[PDB]
Design an enzyme around this catalytic site. Sequence first.
Site, PDB file in Angstrom:
ATOM      1  N   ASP A 141       0.343  13.020   0.865  1.00  0.00           N
ATOM      2  CA  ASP A 141       0.943  12.601   2.242  1.00  0.00           C
ATOM      3  C   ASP A 141      -0.052  13.313   3.252  1.00  0.00           C
ATOM      4  O   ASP A 141      -0.089  12.156   3.888  1.00  0.00           O
ATOM      5  CB  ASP A 141       2.354  12.739   1.834  1.00  0.00           C
ATOM      6  CG  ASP A 141       2.970  12.292   1.153  1.00  0.00           C
ATOM      7  OD1 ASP A 141       3.182  11.335   0.671  1.00  0.00           O
ATOM      8  OD2 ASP A 141       4.396  12.649   1.453  1.00  0.00           O
ATOM      9  N   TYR A 150      -1.315  -2.565   1.544  1.00  0.00           N
ATOM     10  CA  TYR A 150      -0.724  -1.600   0.350  1.00  0.00           C
ATOM     11  C   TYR A 150       0.228  -0.787   0.352  1.00  0.00           C
ATOM     12  O   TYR A 150       0.565   0.518   0.215  1.00  0.00           O
ATOM     13  CB  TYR A 150      -1.870  -0.708  -0.010  1.00  0.00           C
ATOM     14  CG  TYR A 150      -2.278  -1.627  -1.571  1.00  0.00           C
ATOM     15  CD1 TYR A 150      -3.654  -3.102  -1.304  1.00  0.00           C
ATOM     16  CD2 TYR A 150      -2.305  -1.819  -2.250  1.00  0.00           C
ATOM     17  CE1 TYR A 150      -4.135  -3.526  -1.432  1.00  0.00           C
ATOM     18  CE2 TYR A 150      -3.117  -2.000  -3.630  1.00  0.00           C
ATOM     19  CZ  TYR A 150      -4.268  -3.357  -3.609  1.00  0.00           C
ATOM     20  OH  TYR A 150      -4.383  -4.059  -4.292  1.00  0.00           O
ATOM     21  N   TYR A 167      -0.272   8.492  -5.972  1.00  0.00           N
ATOM     22  CA  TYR A 167       0.752   8.701  -6.547  1.00  0.00           C
ATOM     23  C   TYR A 167       1.092   8.465  -7.754  1.00  0.00           C
ATOM     24  O   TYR A 167       1.782   8.466  -8.059  1.00  0.00           O
ATOM     25  CB  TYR A 167       1.795   7.911  -5.505  1.00  0.00           C
ATOM     26  CG  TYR A 167       2.882   8.309  -3.903  1.00  0.00           C
ATOM     27  CD1 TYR A 167       1.878   9.795  -4.042  1.00  0.00           C
ATOM     28  CD2 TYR A 167       3.683   7.391  -3.430  1.00  0.00           C
ATOM     29  CE1 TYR A 167       3.069   9.741  -2.399  1.00  0.00           C
ATOM     30  CE2 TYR A 167       3.916   7.713  -2.619  1.00  0.00           C
ATOM     31  CZ  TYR A 167       4.318   8.924  -2.008  1.00  0.00           C
ATOM     32  OH  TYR A 167       4.660   9.335  -0.821  1.00  0.00           O
ATOM     33  N   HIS A 225      -3.031   6.158  -1.557  1.00  0.00           N
ATOM     34  CA  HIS A 225      -2.434   7.163  -0.762  1.00  0.00           C
ATOM     35  C   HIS A 225      -1.148   6.055  -2.360  1.00  0.00           C
ATOM     36  O   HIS A 225      -0.436   7.269  -2.881  1.00  0.00           O
ATOM     37  CB  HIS A 225      -1.082   6.831  -0.217  1.00  0.00           C
ATOM     38  CG  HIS A 225       0.512   7.673  -0.204  1.00  0.00           C
ATOM     39  ND1 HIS A 225       0.979   6.854   0.183  1.00  0.00           N
ATOM     40  CD2 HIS A 225      -0.317   8.662   0.492  1.00  0.00           C
ATOM     41  CE1 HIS A 225       1.827   7.827   0.264  1.00  0.00           C
ATOM     42  NE2 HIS A 225       1.808   9.016   0.268  1.00  0.00           N
ATOM     43  N   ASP A 226      -0.943   5.016  -3.189  1.00  0.00           N
ATOM     44  CA  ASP A 226      -0.858   4.220  -4.093  1.00  0.00           C
ATOM     45  C   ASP A 226      -1.203   4.358  -5.019  1.00  0.00           C
ATOM     46  O   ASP A 226      -0.610   5.599  -5.937  1.00  0.00           O
ATOM     47  CB  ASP A 226      -0.684   2.803  -3.367  1.00  0.00           C
ATOM     48  CG  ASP A 226       0.030   2.169  -2.999  1.00  0.00           C
ATOM     49  OD1 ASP A 226       0.706   3.189  -1.673  1.00  0.00           O
ATOM     50  OD2 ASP A 226       0.162   1.499  -2.006  1.00  0.00           O
ATOM     51  N   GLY A 240       2.068  -1.536  -1.328  1.00  0.00           N
ATOM     52  CA  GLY A 240       1.636  -2.220  -2.479  1.00  0.00           C
ATOM     53  C   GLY A 240       1.398  -2.886  -3.564  1.00  0.00           C
ATOM     54  O   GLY A 240       2.214  -2.427  -4.476  1.00  0.00           O
ATOM     55  N   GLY A 254       3.512   0.576   2.195  1.00  0.00           N
ATOM     56  CA  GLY A 254       4.934   0.163   2.465  1.00  0.00           C
ATOM     57  C   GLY A 254       4.867  -0.672   1.045  1.00  0.00           C
ATOM     58  O   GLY A 254       6.260  -0.274   0.566  1.00  0.00           O
ATOM     59  N   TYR A 309       8.699  18.094  -0.135  1.00  0.00           N
ATOM     60  CA  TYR A 309       7.995  19.671  -0.584  1.00  0.00           C
ATOM     61  C   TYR A 309       8.211  20.204   0.919  1.00  0.00           C
ATOM     62  O   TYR A 309       8.900  19.527   2.279  1.00  0.00           O
ATOM     63  CB  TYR A 309       6.492  18.778  -0.059  1.00  0.00           C
ATOM     64  CG  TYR A 309       6.147  17.932   0.772  1.00  0.00           C
ATOM     65  CD1 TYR A 309       5.836  17.903   2.259  1.00  0.00           C
ATOM     66  CD2 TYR A 309       6.500  16.418  -0.102  1.00  0.00           C
ATOM     67  CE1 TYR A 309       5.211  17.070   2.486  1.00  0.00           C
ATOM     68  CE2 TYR A 309       5.318  15.141   1.041  1.00  0.00           C
ATOM     69  CZ  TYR A 309       5.267  14.996   2.124  1.00  0.00           C
ATOM     70  OH  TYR A 309       5.164  14.356   2.766  1.00  0.00           O
TER      71      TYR A 309
END
Lengths: 121, 5
Positions: free
Chosen positions: A89, A27, A51, A47-48, A31, A29, A64
């Site tokens: 993040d 997952y 997003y 994290h995936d 995933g 970079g 950000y």
Amino acid sequence: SLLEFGKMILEETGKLAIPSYSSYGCYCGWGGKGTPKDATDRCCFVHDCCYGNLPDCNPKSDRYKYKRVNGAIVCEKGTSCENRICECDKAAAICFRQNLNTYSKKYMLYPDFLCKGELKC
Amino acid sequence: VAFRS
């Protein structure tokens, strides 16, 4: 943005996002499928998913701002998408730091075919 | 850089 995420990753962990987290497990970079290989890869899974919660945001490119309040990441207010991207993040960078102790270089450049199966978010 | 899923 992806570049800011990578600077956050380096700050937290002392590893360069490319190559330490850009091709790791199923997952990180890149995933999509498979059982995550270890806790670091589960950071990337989450994290995936994080997003994925933001279909009308553009986390690769939208920038950000954040600051540190002794050690701690504090996302500063931007647009709604920027705020939500930053929180994704931040969580992943913290997760990578929490799991450095089990990071395994054998999962860098992990081959796709060893990642099979969908795991729901 | 990364650029996944």
